Amino acid sequence: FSDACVHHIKRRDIVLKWELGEGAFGKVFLAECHNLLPEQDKMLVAVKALKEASESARQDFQREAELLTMLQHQHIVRFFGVCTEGRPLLMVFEYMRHGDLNRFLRSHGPDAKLLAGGEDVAPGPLGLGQLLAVASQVAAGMVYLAGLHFVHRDLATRNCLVGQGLVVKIGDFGMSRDIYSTDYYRVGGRTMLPIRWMPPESILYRKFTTESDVWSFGVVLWEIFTYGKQPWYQLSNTEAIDCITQGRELERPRACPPEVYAIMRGCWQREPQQRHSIKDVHARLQALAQAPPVYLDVL
Ligand SMILES: Cn1cc(-c2n[nH]c3ccc(NC(=O)c4ccc(NC(=O)Nc5cc(C(F)(F)F)ccc5F)cc4C(F)(F)F)cc23)cn1
Numbered sequence: 001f002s003d004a005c006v007h008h009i010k011r012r013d014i015v016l017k018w019e020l021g022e023g024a025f026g027k028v029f030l031a032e033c034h035n036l037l038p039e040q041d042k043m044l045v046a047v048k049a050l051k052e053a054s055e056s057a058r059q060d061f062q063r064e065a066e067l068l069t070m071l072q073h074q075h076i077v078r079f080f081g082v083c084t085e086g087r088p089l090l091m092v093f094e095y096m097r098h099g100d101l102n103r104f105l106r107s108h109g110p111d112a113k114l115l116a117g118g119e120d121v122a123p124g125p126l127g128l129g130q131l132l133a134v135a136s137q138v139a140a141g142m143v144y145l146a147g148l149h150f151v152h153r154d155l156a157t158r159n160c161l162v163g164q165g166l167v168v169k170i171g172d173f174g175m176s177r178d179i180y181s182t183d184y185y186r187v188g189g190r191t192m193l194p195i196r197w198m199p200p201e202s203i204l205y206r207k208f209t210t211e212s213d214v215w216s217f218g219v220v221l222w223e224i225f226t227y228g229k230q231p232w233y234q235l236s237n238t239e240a241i242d243c244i245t246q247g248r249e250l251e252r253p254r255a256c257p258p259e260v261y262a263i264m265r266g267c268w269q270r271e272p273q274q275r276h277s278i279k280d281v282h283a284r285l286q287a288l289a290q291a292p293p294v295y296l297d298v299l
Pocket residue numbers: 020021028046047048064067068071076077091093094095096097098099100145152161170171172173176
């Protein structure tokens with residue numbers, strides 16, 4: 001009865017405007033959705049239209065909508081429900097106007113100037129305060145999921161979305177975008193591993209736990225303070241496996257203060273149980289995010 005878990009939207013309430021993205025299993029549109037939120041006769045949504053591989057796409061669709069409905073929470077991608085009346089099957093999401101956090105970081109990097117400012121974000125490179133706010137929110141999402149004993153397995157800035165006001169939410173695009181093909185190592189039967197985000201016990205023993213998500217988060221932090229650089233960008237995939245398995249650590253970013261770099265290092269303890277808790281990591285980044293300018297100045 002996945003049917004009964006998920007919210008449903010009338011097809012006539014959705015008006016497609018133009019495509020946002022396209023993959024093997026469907027197209028994503030920006031759309032107007034009517035009579036979805038009480039005080040909005042009309043709001044923008046992102047709609048995924050399922051390109052069908054028949055019984056398996058239908059089942060994965062229902063499983064994914066059920067899961068997303070269960071996990072709804074402040075720093076998780078907001079899912080509004082499905083449209084199963086006719087084909088194509090549609091999934092309806094909140095529209096996140098800045099797109100994915102990796103792209104957002106790269107367009108506010110250390111070269112940005114006055115032009116890169118906007119309604120939402122100052123010109124130039126994101127400042128320490130905004131970098132920390134981004135990190136705090138993503139870690140909050142991972143506290144919630146760890147609270148539910150849910151393991152992500154592909155936590156990365158490319159899988160987080162940034163909305164108006166720099167609200168950041170975690171999602172899972174499911175290895176679907178050509179621009180991030182480089183972030184995955186292709187093994188048997190087009191299996192894709194995001195090795196650069198994986199801890200040693202994942203690479204060596206094929207284990208991924210909540211503690212492997214805290215290591216992945218540490219790489220997310222590094223991505224954030226490098227403005228979206230790929231971890232181990234100077235290395236091939238196999239060199240990256242060698243460096244990770246043999247204990248090599250990502251270098252402190254220029255924009256990263258030593259206190260935040262200590263948070264990353266705590267995520268990258270070699271033995272999973274020696275890693276800090278994500279709750280503790282979140283608490284430290286929140287404390288820093290909320291700190292007065294006097295304090296942040298001297299970091
Ligand atoms: C400028 N711009 C704005 C946007 C934009 N705004 N909002 C958007 C919503 C979707 C997409 N695109 C996607 O592909 C897309 C992205 C994510 C999801 N599902 C997903 O995360 N599931 C999920 C999450 C979790 C976790 F992480 F929560 F624990 C655990 C398990 C899970 F299964 C599905 C799609 C799908 F559409 F394929 F369905 C783009 C936009 C695009 N460009």
